[PDB]
Each structure stands twice: as structure tokens, then as C-alpha cells.
Assembly symmetry: C3
Homo-oligomer: 441 residues x 3
């Protein structure tokens, strides 16, 4: 049948000690709640109903919005969404702070819901302390008892409520209408709806997650960090099984997506962010950070190199200690060495910038040698200007190129030159500065 989702995002995240709404805190670079939304979309949800208390502005700025003005609990929260439920759709209840719930588990949950009844996700814990206990009579679920209100006998129950469940909209709206708030907490308890479904003589079927981490909620940053490590380990293991050699999968982080070829080797402490594409036989040395980059076949990134919005073609070498900024592009066989920064600049085929250089806003040809210490002066304090270097140019060490300026093919620039005017094809330019020599200084 058809289905929509309600994501509860309206708890108080006091133990996060944060000014950022709890469900916005990221896991693997993505807000927790977005993990949950992604899963919902994968399930084929027709609507996603997001219930919130505060941070509504930032929530909408970041990500069907449903206000819960007073933090009066989950039952009350659902009461707020209930009018938006279709009588003819299934409604899946999820939490914005339970980010690792898997599509497989949810699919099995939807499959297990008995006609007219409820599908309830439960899990058996070694220590169920503090959790809602699943109450069964002769094997069938009839009730949930919260820890606080549970008796000593009930507290021996190990099967507990994850709070994730599915029911038909018409049925759900009915059960929510029958909730009672007259009690020691002054709130409606969502958990009472399973007893209410039972009262109507309807069935509550259960399924279990595959992993405990799937139904773990985040209330503080220690708990978020554990889930971060679980998720990173999962990603790392998939990459290994898919043929990427991670030299230490416990020291690898992916925060986005990695599209990869064959026989790649990634060394320790590499961080991949955004969407990165790696060709065949790429090697990434220790400590590198890549964000939104494309790296061509057989390229080698040496240790402690940082790249963002950069492109390497095949057979390129970069680093160690290089810094590629957005718009940095290396054509086939180009080389960028240590203590070199490239920004919005292209280095043509086989061209080399091996040391202690800044190349910004530059179009550099093929077969070019950029000597150590070369710098493009691309900024006048108001605007930025382009440097153009042709093919087969030799730029001597510690030269400044003062943009806008063009150096034609075949030219040679002497060490220590300040280039302010265009250089013609096959021209040598060199500073003829006079020195004083003083004997016996």
C-alpha cells in the first residue's frame, strides 16, 4: 500500500549543551535527521511529516513542517501530526535522533504490520534498564510498560520498545484520540496505543533490527561519537570488500561519497569529504584530506596534502605538503611539490611546480618548469588578475609574475625576476642588478 512518515524532532536536547538543535548535529558530515529523511525517501514515503518544537527557523533553513508548540511529549506530538494522516495510507513513526535505522529493517517492519493492527520494532538488550518493556501474554504483544512504572517482575523483561512503529492512518488517528493525559506526568504516552490497539482486538506484530546501533538514540555527544565510529567502520569495510585497500580502516573517514576504480591504495588518516572520484591505481598517502575532487588514473597524492574542488588528470603527482584550492587543475603528468599552493589555476601536461610557490588565477601551459619560490601577484587590494604562461617556458627561481601578464611559448625567465610586462616567444628576460662587493666585512 501507500505510506508516509512522521519524524519526531521535538525533544529537548539538554545534554548536548549546544545552541544547535540536536537533530541537526552531523554524523559523517550530514545532519542526523537527514539520515532519517534519506531512509524515508528510500522507502518511498509520499509525505515526510517533521514535528518540531524549537529551532524551526534553522531546521527549515537547513532541510511537511508540523509545530508542537508545547513540549508535552510524543503522544501529544503525534496528535499534532494526526490531522495530516490519510485514512488510506500507512504511517511510519521515526525519530530524528536515531540516525542509523536501516531501510531493510523498516521494510521488514512494514511487511509485518497485520491488517488493522500495528508493526512494532523491538530489540532485546542485555541490560533493558531505563527502557520501555514489551508486555506479552501467551506470546502476543498486548502492552508496553515504561521502566519507571514497571514492577520488579516486569523489569526482568529484556525485550524493549524502540519507539519505531507503523499503523494505518485511520486506525492511528483513532488510537491517538483515546490517549489519556490525566497522570503523574500530565502527558499523553505514545506507548499506550499498542494497549489500545489490543483493546480493539487488533494484532501488534514485531520485528527486530539486525544491529543494535540501528535503534540507538543520541542524547549527548558521547553517544553521537560512538555512532560516528560505527558508521565509519561500516563504510570502511564496504570499501575494502569492494576492492579499495585501506592500510588502516580504523583511521579512515568518509563524509560524503567515494566513487572509485580498481587497485587504489589509501594510507592512514585520510579524510574524504563531499563527493570524490578516484580512477584506477590511485595512491593516497598518509594524512591527506580530499573534498569534492576528481583524481585520474595512476595519480599519486603524497602525504599531508589538502585538496578541495581540485582535478588531477592521469599520472599526476602532488605533495607532500601541497595545498590545492578550488579551481586547481593538473593536466596529464603534471607535478606539484612541497609547500606549493594552487588556486583557480591550471598546470598543463608534464608541467612542474616543485617547491615553495603560489600559483593563483593562472593559465599555465605544457612543458613548463616553475622554479622554487615563484609567486603570482594576482591581487591589487581591490581586484584579482590573471597570469598566462605558454608552453615550454622556464621560470627561474624566486620570480614574481605581476598580473595581468602573459609569458609566450618558449620563453625563459631568469632567477629573481619581477615580471610586469608581457614576454615574447623564445625571449630571455633577466634582471641585471648591480651589486656592491665589500672586502673584509
Amino acid at each position: 500500500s501507500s505510506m508516509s512518515v512522521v519524524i519526531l524532532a521535538a525533544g529537548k536536547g539538554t545534554r548536548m549543551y549546544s545552541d544547535l538543535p540536536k537533530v541537526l548535529h552531523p554524523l559523517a558530515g550530514k545532519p542526523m535527521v537527514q539520515h532519517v529523511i534519506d531512509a524515508a525517501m528510500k522507502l518511498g514515503a509520499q509525505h515526510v511529516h517533521l514535528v518540531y518544537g524549537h529551532g524551526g527557523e534553522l531546521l527549515k533553513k537547513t532541510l511537511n513542517w508540523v509545530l508542537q508548540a508545547e513540549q508535552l511529549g510524543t503522544g501529544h506530538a503525534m496528535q499534532q501530526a494526526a490531522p495530516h494522516f490519510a485514512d488510506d495510507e500507512d504511517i511510519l513513526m521515526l525519530y530524528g535522533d536515531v540516525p542509523l535505522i536501516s531501510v531493510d529493517t523498516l521494510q521488514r517492519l512494514l511487511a509485518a504490520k497485520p491488517e488493522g493492527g500495528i508493526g512494532l520494532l523491538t530489540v532485546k538488550l542485555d541490560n533493558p534498564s531505563g527502557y520501555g518493556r514489551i508486555v506479552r501474554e501467551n506470546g502476543d504483544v498486548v502492552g508496553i510498560v515504561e521502566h519507571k512504572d514497571a514492577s520488579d517482575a516486569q523489569r526482568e523483561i529484556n525485550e524493549i520498545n524502540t519507539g519505531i512503529l507503523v499503523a494505518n492512518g485511520r486506525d492511528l488517528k483513532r488510537w491517538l484520540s483515546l490517549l489519556d493525559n490525566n497522570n503523574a506526568q500530565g502527558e499523553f504516552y505514545i506507548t499506550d496505543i499498542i494497549a489500545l490497539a489490543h483493546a480493539d482486538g487488533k494484532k501488534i506484530a514485531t520485528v527486530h533490527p539486525t544491529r543494535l546501533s540501528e535503534v540507538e538514540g543520541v542524547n549527548n555527544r558521547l553517544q553521537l561519537s560512538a555512532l560516528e565510529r560505527v558508521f565509519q567502520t561500516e563504510q570502511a569495510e564496504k570499501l575494502l570488500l569492494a576492492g579499495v585497500m585501506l592500510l588502516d580502516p580504523s583511521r579512515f573517514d568518509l563524509r560524503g561519497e567515494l566513487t572509485h576504480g580498481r587497485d587504489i591504495t589509501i594510507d592512514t588518516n585520510v579524510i574524504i569529504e563531499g563527493h570524490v572520484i578516484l580512477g584506477d591505481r590511485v595512491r593516497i598517502g598518509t594524512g591527506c584530506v580530499l573534498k569534492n575532487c576528481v583524481i585520474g588514473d595512476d595519480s599519486e597524492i603524497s602525504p599531508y596534502t589538502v585538496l578541495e574542488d581540485a582535478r588531477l588528470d592521469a599520472n599526476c603527482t602532488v605533495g607532500p605538503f601541497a595545498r590545492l584550492r578550488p579551481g586547481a587543475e593538473l593536466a596529464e603528468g603534471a607535478h606539484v611539490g612541497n609547500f606549493v599552493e594552487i588556486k583557480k589555476a591550471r598546470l598543463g601536461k608534464g608541467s612542474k611546480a616543485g617547491h615553495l610557490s603560489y600559483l593563483g588565477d593562472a593559465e599555465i601551459g605544457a612543458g613548463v618548469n616553475i622554479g622554487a619560490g615563484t609567486i603570482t601577484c594576482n591581487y591589487d587590494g581591490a581586484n584579482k588578475f590573471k597570469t598566462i604562461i605558454g608552453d615550454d617556458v622556464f621560470v627561474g627561481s624566486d620570480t614574481q609574475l605581476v598580473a595581468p601578464v602573459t609569458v609566450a611559448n618558449g620563453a625563459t625567465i631568469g632567477a629573481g625576476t619581477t615580471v610586469t610586462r608581457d614576454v615574447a616567444e623564445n625571449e630571455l628576460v633577466i634582471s641585471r642588478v648591480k651589486q656592491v662587493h665589500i672586502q673584509g666585512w
Copy 2:
């Protein structure tokens, strides 16, 4: 009552293979024995009696000193300290190589000591092999039997001696006087004092540590490394619960103290040393090392940045690959980029040094742009001299400023300039060097 501590620091650390006395080997940046002293001071010890064998010079240089001339054992060691005990104080016995003993455990130990008797810290191990066994008769402690001298029946005992205990000074001095040395080892066994206390009809009460790591001793560097990881994990978890987001708490080290604000994010492989203070919303990228630094609100430290004795005001950005040395100071909104080293220099509000620069012994104003490749020549081979740069100065790329020299407000320095004489307000200075152009080179 009143209390003093005896710390035993006189064992042979042969399996450390070190020229540094064993108890001086650090854990989280602090000698093991100093952890123990700190705990003692927290307990309110009136005196700390440190018993040593060798390395006394270095020990005192590093940290009431009590010689044990001949390594004749713990009983003998205590005999050496006994004359310093007051008849009217409690004496707590600790070890310099058991660094994680907690104040809580010790407080409970002091509370459990029966009048006229002994408080003894014991622990139950899955494998008690090699440890002193606690001998009980009808539930009461009467004895300790060392493993070697224990029978097969005794060796089944899992409750073992940690060697940590407390007794009144007068009582202790008596029991120590009654120790016998005529045996297969020629030494007095400290453990005999519990049997001696029993002989006098006094009670020996026991308490247990909360964690096994609290009473683990260090005899080799493998054991020290395990304790280092335990301690770092504890620190990391406290920081997470306190609201600091560590993106991987297994790749975080604190060796000193971290004072922090709210909504801080620290990425993998960060090392914090000395005392570091972080404002709200500070972000620290992967690989950074901070030692004795103050970082203001909303500052961002990019990957692979090293800072020591440095100060950032609010909204500053530094790195990646920047190196801030002692006396480096950034005013609000300042920026230091890649391959820049700052030493005993201040960069004023909104001023920028983005690349490949060395700024030492310099006072730099607000609104200054330091071009790539700029270097302060602060050294003449004997002394060091200051560079002063006013507000709203534009320093062109690859300039050297030869100190002492002053550049006034509003000035502009052309690329490639060697500045040796003061520059006046709103002055442009630029090198007019002649070049040779040779066609067809």
C-alpha cells in the same frame, strides 16, 4: 582525623630499559609519580614522604625525601620512613608507579579503616597469578600470602593485594618493628603487617577500586602505554559529555588541561598540551597541535597547524600548514594561511598573511595585506630587531623587510622590494630594476 602519605618510589625499573627513573616516566605529559602526589594533595595530606633508592638528584630536581640506601624491599622501605610518622596521624601507603589510583577510592579506603586497625585496598582478578592472595577466615581478613609461597589451594583465591593501605602511625610503627627478615629472600615483607595487626586482635577492613586500571602498576613501557590509552579515553569521554564534539575520541590526546566554551568541534588526531583555552564555536581541523594557547570565539584552525604560546582573538583563521611560535598574536578577524610562520609578532584586526611568509619580531597593524613570500629579516647573526608595519599597508609579494624598519600607515610596497629604510605615510615604494631581454634564447 589528620593524615599523611608515603609514596614508595624505590623499586628497580629494570624492564623499562631506561636511564630515567621509572616513576618519572610520563603519563599524559606528567610524571607517573606526580599523578600520585596530586591525588595525595587532593586528599589533604599534611606530609608526603617519598622513599627513593637511586635517581634522587633527578627526582628532587623534577618534583619529604627519604633515602633507602639498600633496595631491601618495601617493608624495609617503610621502616626507613617510619620515624617520620606522627603517632596521631593516619598513614596512607601508595606507589609511585600506580598512577591512576583515584581520590574516590582512597577516600573510601580512609573511611573504612577500623579504629586501631588497617584499611586495605584489594581487587578481585580473573587471573590472580603472581599476586598476593588475601587470606580470610570466616569472612575476615587475617593474612596475605604471596603467590610464590602460596599453596595450590591458596592460589585459587581471586582477591589480591594491591599493596595500598592505611593505618594509624603509632600502630604502623609497631607492626613494622616486628617484621622478620630471616627468610629465603633476606627481606622484610610489608604484607606481614596485616597478620601482625590480626595477632594484636585488630581489624583489617577492605574496599575495592572502581576500575582495575586504578591499581595497575607500571614495570615496562607496554604497561605504561595501556594506562596512557585508558587515561586519554577517560579524558575524551568527559569532554564529549561536557559538550565538546570530538570527531574521533580514540584519536585525541590531552596532555595538560583544556578550558573550553560551547559548540567546539575538534577533528581527528589533535594533540592539546599544557593549558589551552578555547572560546565558543572554535573549530580545530585534523592533525593540529596546540600547546599553551588561547583561541577566541568562532576561530577556525585548519588542518596540520602547529601552535605554541599563541593567541587568537575572535573570528580568526589559521592554516592549513601554518606554524605559530611563542608570542604569535592575531587580533580579531586576522588570517594566517599556508606555509606561514609567525614568531613574537602581532597581526592586527582583519590583517592577512596568506602564504609562504616568515613574520618574526614584528608589530603589524590593522587592514594589512602581507603578500605571499614576504619575510622579516630580524637577525644579523648576533642580535634580533623589530619590524613595524602600520594600518592599511599593502606589502607586495616576495618583499624582505630588513629590521629595524618602520612602514607607516597607508603605504604600498611593490613586489620584490628590499625595504631597508623607513617608509612614510601613503608612500609607494618600488624597485626599479632594469632587465635585459634577449630575443631567440
Copy 3:
């Protein structure tokens, strides 16, 4: 008796997803199969028979070669090697993808082989699923039953076949000749030889490895990564017990050999490759990579320093963010600072290159100060040339030395100089460039 080894290297490594033969994939910097060969040589093998299917070219290029033209299984594989066995030697069967098998285990295996019979290495697993089961009758091994062909009763057996075994050559050749291929797989099963040995009334003795990891095979990169971590942890623990202080042994990698002195400290995330030699009291900061280097007593390598084929004498300091390339050599007390690259260059006693410099193909004397920004121009686009700097030379900041060129003892080079001609003893050389000053720019 005398002994030879057969290493099976002819499986299909489909789940590696690699163009490199599976047994060539490295563990700790060394092909898996080379670990196995090393063990064989340590055992005193007279011959090593390597059976292969494909990748024979690359295998021989990388490492008695024995073709198995058709991947028809292990029995068939051994049939191919059998003619090379001496009737009067023991033959040990190993696998190229089981890299951590220990010499101790193998020695015990060889010792346990009964005259005329077989020594078989087996292991007891918590989950034996998918493994060959060891079949015993009244305690004696008579059979091996592969999982697939095993009954439900047989599958309860926890003792499984590692496939590692030893038998006399004459005996082995006989048993291999009697293998039957007429079955649902069309292959000879090596495991049948133990039933065949039993048929002849010979004994099959068993021994067990000390660690499970010793007999773990690699079929995919996830499995290789687990073995990599096991191996690195073993190496790290040995180094700690031997007296090297690793500040985090889970963040330490050795890919080769480390020869070390006393009281060394290595911080987190250090990678040692090739053969590295460290003197006493060397400290290595976080993030460093050392490959084929010799570091003298009391030297300190600061964070994020990369060295290859480099030599430091005693009391040297390098980094942070320094890059030493092959042929880099520092004499006693020399210093290389941040953003400095040294290649095929020697820095003499007490000489300093603290910042933003490139020194290549250079002989630099003692007592030299290399100012920030100094660069050797060692390349003309075709060849490379040497720079020679004498003792007690002061090179001013941002100087280029244009090789070949010699600077004699005692000389001083002014900031910003382009040195193209030899400098005489005690000479000051300095650029006298004229500037334009424009007021009110």
C-alpha cells in the same frame, strides 16, 4: 632430517578485485608470499617450490617455479610439484595467502610428524562453518571431511583443517598418485591424502598454532587489513617491551625494520619504512614518516616531517613541516626548520636553515646561517649543478644561489641577492637596487 617447502600460490583471487596476483599484495610493506618464503628460509628449507597459475611473469619479476596450467585444485597442484620432491626429504606444504604462520608453529609441526606418516596443523574454532573438519576415531586422526560434504553430525566438529602439513617425499608422492578425480567437482582433493595415509596404517599427528591469526588466509582486502593490524600491533608491542616509548601503539606502523637505541620516544601516527636506525634519546613528533634513514643520538624530529634516505648526526633538529629527500645530510647540531626542503645536500655542524628554503645539490659548511627564503637554483632545464657554501657564511633572506657557484668562508650575502659568481673569503655581497618613492599613492 632435510626438508623442502611447497608454497601454493595458484588460487583465483577473484574477491580481491585486483590486477595484481593475490599473493603479491603486501602486508607491512612486503608481499604476503614473501612473508611465507622468509619463514621457509628460516626453517632451513633446501628448496622452495612455488606453484602458480597466472601472473607468473610478475611473480618471478618480484620474487623453484612450478606451473599449474589448469586451476584444477590443490591436489592437482601438488601433483605438479611432486616430481621435484626428493624421496629422502620432508616436504612442508604452505600457502602463499596465509602470511602470519610462525616459525615456531612450523618447527613443532615438523617435530610431530610420525615416521612414515604425516604432521598436520589444525585449529579449533568457535565457528568451524565452511572449514574442513578433522575426523578422529578413538582420538586418532583418520580423515578430513570438507564442510560441503559433511553431515550434520560431522559439522559439530570444531577442530578444522588449516591445510598445512608435512610428509616424507616418497610417501607423499605415493599418496598423491592415488588421488581420485571422478567426483561432483572433477578435481583431486588434497585432503584425501590423510585418509590414504591411514589406509596404509600410518599415523597422522597434529599440532595447533599459538594464535588463530597464524593460519588465517586472505581472500579479500578486508581480511588482509585485519592481518595488517594484528601484525602492526605485534611489532608495536615488541618495541615497547624492548624499551621504545610509543605514545600510542595503535597509531604506529612499521613497514620494514627499526634498529633502535635507548630512551626513544615516538609520538602518534608515525610510519617507519625500509630500514631505519635511531640512536639514543631520539624523539619523533606526531605524523612523521621516515624511510631508510639514520638518526643520531639526541636528535629531535618535530611534527609532520617527511624523511627519505636522509642522515642526521647527533643533536640535530628538523621540522616541523620539513621535507628531507635522498642524500639530505645534517652534521652534528644542524637545524632544518619549517617549510624547508633538502635534497642531495649536506648541512655542516651547527648550521641552520630555519624557513621557507630549498637546498638541493649543495655542500654547506659549518656555522652557516641560511636565511628564510633562500633557494639553490640547481637546474637549467637539462642538467643539475652544485652550490658550495663555506664555513661561517651568513646568507641573507630571499637569496638565490645560481649553481654552479661557490661562496667562501666568512662571507655575508645581503637579503634579496641573486648570486651568480663566486664569493671570496670574508666578502660582503649586496644588491644595490634603486627604488622609486612616490608620495600620496
